[model samples]
Target: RSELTIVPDFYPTMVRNFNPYLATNLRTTTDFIYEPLVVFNEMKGNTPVFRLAESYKMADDLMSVTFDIRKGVKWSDGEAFTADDVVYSFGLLKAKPELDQRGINKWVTSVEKVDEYKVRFRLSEANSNVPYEISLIPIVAEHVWKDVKDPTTFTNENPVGTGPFTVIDTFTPQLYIQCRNPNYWDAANLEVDCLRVPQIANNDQLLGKIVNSELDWTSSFVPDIDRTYAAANPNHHYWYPAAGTQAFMVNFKNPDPAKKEALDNVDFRRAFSMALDRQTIIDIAFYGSGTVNDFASGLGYAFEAWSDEATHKKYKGFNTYDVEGSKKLLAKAGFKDVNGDGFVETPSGKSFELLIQSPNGWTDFNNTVQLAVEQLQEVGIKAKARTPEFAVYNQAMLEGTYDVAYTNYFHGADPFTYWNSGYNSALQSGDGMPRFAMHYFTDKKLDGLLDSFYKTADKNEQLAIAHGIQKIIAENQVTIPVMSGAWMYQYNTTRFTGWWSEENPKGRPSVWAGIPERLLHVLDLKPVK
Candidate 1:
C-alpha cells in the first residue's frame, strides 16, 4: 500500500470534542493530538519514566513537585516550549470547568515558576501521584491555544500538536488526514510521511478495505472478524496482548439511595465478579483471542505485576466462579426473594434488576452485556442490557442513571491515575463522573489512607498506599473488575514494521522514560518483505 490508512471498528460520535483540556472520549482523541509528559510502554503497565520533563522530584511532604523541562522542545506550531506553557495550560484548564473536569487545576494550589527551565507545582494536599497525572495529559501550546477564545468552539480542522503528525485536514464524520510535520521534534525518527484515519463501522467493510489494500490498519477488531480475515489474507496480521482494560463500571451515584447501597456493598460487588466466568467470556465473547484480566493486571507482560503467587492467592476468590458463595453473600446482605418471583429483593423491597447501558453502535457492547446477563441469571439476579443511543448513553452515565455499564476503563500506563476517581466515594460527586451513581460511598479510613499516601514523598510509602487502596477496594467490592486487555489493532505487516507491544515491556514505566512519545514515530517501523 502506497498510503497507510486506518479504519477504526466504529466511528467517533463526537470528533469536535478533541480538546485535551476537556474530558471527552479518552480513547480516540487523547492518543492522537496531545503528548503527555510520559507514555507507558505497552510492555510495562504503570511505571512512567518521563516525556516532556527530563527529571522530576517531590519535596518531603509532596507539598511541591519540581520539574525540569526537556531542553529544545517546541510545540507543533514551532512556539518555544517552556515552564510558562505548563503554568498557562494549568490556568486555562482551571478556568473552564467543562474542559478538564478531572480537576487538574483545582488539585494544584498553584504553579510556581522556579526559573525559565524549571517549575514547581504546589499542591492542595500532599499528592505523591501528581507526577503520574502529568504523564496522563497532553501539554498544549501556550502561545497558540491562548489565541483561541474558546477551545470547545475552535475548529477541529487544524489542531496543533507536538506529535509526529499535525492535523493537516479532517473530513467531517469520516476521515482525518495528517502530513508528517517536517518540524516535528522527532521528525528524524519517523518511518512515514503521512497518516490517515477513516471513520468505519462494519467489520466486514473495514476488512474488505484492508484486504483490498485500501486501508493499512484498523483497531479493536471483533475477534471473529479478525480470524476470518487473517485466515483468508496472508498479508494481514492481528496484534494482541497489549495493555489496557475493558470492564463494566456501575454508577453508584444513581438518584435512588437504596440502589446506591446495594451497588456500593463489597459483598454484592464480589458476587458479581464471582458470577462472571471471565475465561469463558474471553473464549466466547472475544473468540478465544484475549487473555482474562484480573483487575489492574492486563494482558501478556503487564500481567506480571498482579499475577504473582501472592496476588494469585489473594485473589483466588475472584478467579473462581463461586455461585454458592455469591448466593450466600447476597442472602446475607438481605437480598432475598421476598415476593417469591424467583428474583432477589433489596433491603427496601425493590426487585434487584440490572439496567445495563452500552454505546449505540458497538456490537461488542451487546455481546459483553448478554454474557454478563447470562452469568447474573445463574445466581438468581435478574439482569438485562439496554443499548441506548450514544448521546443518550453519555447523558445517562453523566447524569448517574445506569445500574451497570459495559465500557472500557483504560489506564494508559499508570494504575494510580486509573483508580483515583471513578468509584472513589470522595471523588464521585461533582469532580468526575461517578462510576457508582446509585449511591456515594463514604469511608473516613480509606479517605485518610489516600490522603496520607498522597502526602508521603517516599516512593515506598506511595506503593504501600497503592497496595492498601487495592486491598480496600477488593475487600469492599466497590466495583467488580472483570478483565483487562488491549484495544485490538489490525495492521498490514508488509507495509510497516517496528510496531512493538505497548503494554508490558522489560523495564516498563522506566523504559517509557527514554522514548517519551516514540509511538507516533515511523523510525521504529520497518517495511516488511
Candidate 2:
C-alpha cells in the first residue's frame, strides 16, 4: 500500500474533532479529512475552485449565494452527503461564539436548504467575498454532530466526512494515522493508501527523520539547509515559496500607560522601524535566504500582483535602516539620554526600555529578536528580548499585555483576509484584539475603506482600496516588517515522485497550521515505481 509519513513540530490539539469552527488548531488536519464547499487555488492567486459544491451562483445584489452540491458524494460513515449537511454546518458555526470571532457571522444572515442537493446562503450585506469566506468553514455530518452536546469539548474519535481520507485508529497526542476512504468522492484520483503524522520535539528531530529517509514530507525550517540535508540526502528535495512576512507587532495599547503613550507616537514608531537591520537579521537567522520586507506591503506573496513596482516605489525608503535618521527621529519624538546611561529616555524622564517578546524554542525568532535588541541599542534605544513560553506569549499578545512581539503577521492567499483579520475594528474587540495587527490602532476612514473593499465586486476598486490601506499603514508604522522568507517545504523524493518543486510548481506544499491549500500537496503526491 502507498503510505506517506510526516514529522511535524507538534501534534494538533484535537485531531479527531475535525471541528475548525470551534477548535482553531483542528484546521490543518481537518482540511485533510473534512471537505469544504470551495477551496482557493493558491497557484492561481487564491481563485475559488469548486470542491464539494459542483457550481454556485451569486445574486445580482451580492446578498445571497446558491450552491449546487456535488451529487454521488458520500460521507465516511456511509451516509449520503447532501444539502442538510451544509445547512447544519452553518447552524453549528452560529451556535459557537468562537467561530464568528472573525466577523463572519456579522455578514451571514441565514443558511437554508433549497433542495436535497442544493444549499443557499443569505447575507446581511452585499459582500462579494462571502463565498470565499464560506469556503473556510468545513461541513460536518449532520446526523452525527447534531447529537453532540458541546462541540467545543467533544472528542470526535472517528470523524465522518466527504473528504479523501478517514481516521483508521484512535488518535494519540504523539501519533495520528489516516487511511484513504473508500467512499471518498475523489477516491479514484487518490494515490497514497495511508498518511502518518508524528509529533516531533524540534526541527532537528524532524530533519534527522528526513535525512534517515524515515519521514516522507515536512514543512520545517532548517538553518543552513542546503549544506545540511541537501548535502546529506541526494534523494531529498525542498521547495521554498515567499508565503508570509515576519514582523514585530508593537502593542500600541500596552497596559502600562507610559509605554502605551510612548509607543503611540508616530515618530517613535517610525524611528523604531528604521532601526532594525533587516539584512543582518536575515543573514544570521535565515542564512541569507530572505528579503527585506516592505513595511507598506506586509501582505507578502498573497498580494504580489497588487504590490507592483509603482506601488512599492511610492513607499520606498520608509523602513530602511539608517542610524542617523533613527537617532534624529527619536530626538524629534522627545527622547533624550538625560541620565547618560547610553539609552534614550522618555520626555517625562522615565527610563525607556522596549521589551520584545518571542516564543521560546523558536531559535530563529529568538536570534532575530536578540539581533534587533543589539541594533536598537546602537541607536541609543534601550531594548531587550524576552523569551516566554509559547502559550504565555500568545496570550499576552491577544490580551494586549505586550510592548512588542515577534511573529508572522499574515498568511493565506487573499489580501482581504489579512485586512479583515488584522485591521477591521469590528473584528478587533473582545478576545480577538491584538491578533495579527496587534497594534490596537484603528481609523474610521480605513475601516470604511475595508468595508467598501469587501462589499464591492469590482477588482479595480478593490485594488485601489488595497493601495489606500497600504499607504495608511506605511505612514502609521503599525507593525515593523522585519523580513520575508520562502516557506521551506522538504520532502523525501525517493518514495514519492510527484512532490511539488520550482520546475513543476503545482501548488504550495508547506504544511501551515490552518491553510486549506496544503491539502492539495497531499492529493498530488504519487508513489514512485
Candidate 3:
C-alpha cells in the first residue's frame, strides 16, 4: 500500500478525540480525518469550495445561509452523512460555551435541518464572512455523538468521520497510523492508501528525519534551510509563500506599573518600533526570504491594496528603521542616559530594562528576539532576551507577564479574522484573556470600525474599516511589525507525486496543511513508486 510519513515538531497532548470543536490542540491532526463543510482554495485566491456541503446560498440580508449536503456520503463507521449531522454539530458548539473561542458559535443563532439533505444557518447578526466561518466547523456523526452525555468529556478513542482517511491505530506519545477510508465519499478518486505520522519531540529530530529521507512532508522551521537542508535533500522541494506576519508584541500590562506606563506611552512604543531592523532579522533569521510588515492586519496580499499607496506613505514611520530617530523619541519622552553605561532611565529615574521572551525551542523566534535586543541596546534601551519552555512562555503571554514577546500578528486570509480576534476589547478580557491580550488597549472609534467591518457587505466599507484600524495600530505601535512571509513547508517526493508547488499550484501538503481548508491536498497526492 502507498503510504506517506510525516513528522510534526511536537506531538499533540490528546489524539483520541477527533472533534475539532472539543479538542484544545491537535485539531490540525484531527482535520485530516474530520472534514469541514467548505474548504478554502488558497491557490484560487482563498475562494470557498464545497467539501462536505455541495453548495450554499447566502440570504439577502446576509444573516442566513442555506447549504445543500453532498449525497451518497458515508462515515468511516458506515453511517449515512446527512444534514442532521450538520445541525447536531452546530448544536454542540452552541450548547458548550468553551467551544465559542473562535466566535462562530456566538455569531450563529440557530442551525435548522431544512430537509434530509439540506440545512440552514441563522446568524445572530449580519456577517458577510459567515460562509467562510461556517466552513471551519467540523461535522460529527449524529448517530455516534447524540447519545454521548458530554461531548467535551467524552474520549472519542474510535472516531468516526466522513473524511478520506480513518485512524486505524493510535499509540499516543509515539505513533499515529491512519488508513484510507474505503467507503469515503471520494474513495474512487483518492490515491494514497495510508498515512503514518510519527511523534517527533524536537526540531532537531524532525530535521534529521527529513535529511535521512524518512519524512514525506514536514512544516518545521529549519535554520538556513535552503543552503543546508534543501541542498542535501535535493529530491525534496519546499516553498515559502506569504501567509502571516511575524511580530513582537509589547506587554502593555507589565507586572510593574512604572514599566507598564513606559510601554503604554505612544512615544516610547514608537521609539521601540523604530529601533527594530526588520530587514536584518529577515536576512539572519529567515535567510532574506521575507517582507517587511507595516500594518497590524496581516492581510499579506491585500494589506497594501486595502490601505492604498497614499495611506501607506502617510504612515511610513510605522515601517521605518531609524536608530537615531528612536533615540530622539526616547529623549523627547523624558528618558535619559544618567550613567555613561548606555542604557536609558525612565522619567522616574529607574533603569528601564525591557525583557523580550521567546519559546526555548523555537530557533527562529529566539534568533529574532536576540537580534531585536541588540538593536534596542544600540538605541540606548536596555533589552534582555529570555527563552522559556513553550508552556511557560505561552502562559506568560496569556497573563501579560513579559515586557515583550515574539508572536504572530495574524494569519493571512481575511482582514476581519485578524482585526476581530486581535484588536477587539471584548476578546481581551475574561476567558479570552491572554490570548488576545493587547494590554487592555481599547478605543471606542476602533471598536465601532471593527463592528462596522463585520456587519457591512460592501467591500469598499470593509476596506475603509481595515485602513482605519491599520492606521490606528501603526500610530499606537500596538505590535512591533518585524517581517512577513509564507510558512516554510517542505515535502519529500520520493514516495509521492502531485505535491503542491508553484508550477502545479493545486494543493498545499506542507506542515500548515493540517487545517480542514487544506485537506483536499492530502487526497491529491499520488503514489510515485
Return the top candidate by lDDT: 2
* Residues 199-312 of candidate 2: C-alpha lDDT, one tens digit per residue: 666555666666777888777777788777888878878888776688888888887766876788877777787788888888988888778886555656446676655656
Q: Tens digits of per-residue lDDT for model 1 on 206-284?
A: 6556666566655645546555667767766655544455666766566667666667666677677778887887777
**Residues 1-529, candidate 3, lDDT per residue (tens digit)?**
8877865446433355455554334434445677777887644556887778899999988889999999988898888999989898888877875555456766789999899999999988887778877876677888998998988777666778788777565555577677787678888778877777787766666777777778887777777776667788668678766666667777877878767868888788778888989888889987787888765333443456676555556556745799888999899898888877788888777776888888776777888999999999988888899988766776776667878888764353566656676777766654323354454677888777876786886788778888888777665667776767666778887888877777776644455533454477777788886
The Cα error of candidate 1 at residue 203, in Å, is 5.2
Off by over 4 Å in 2: 8-18, 22-28, 297-315, 411-414, 430-434
What lDDT is obtained when candidate 3 is compared to the true structure? 0.73
Q: Which stretches of candidate 3 lie above 4 Å from their native place?
A: 12-19, 22-24, 170-172, 296-302, 337-341, 429-439, 507-509
Ranked by TM-score, the better of candidates 1 and 3 is: 3
Q: What lDDT does each candidate get?
A: 0.61, 0.75, 0.73
TM-score of 3: 0.91
Better of 2 and 3 by TM-score: 2
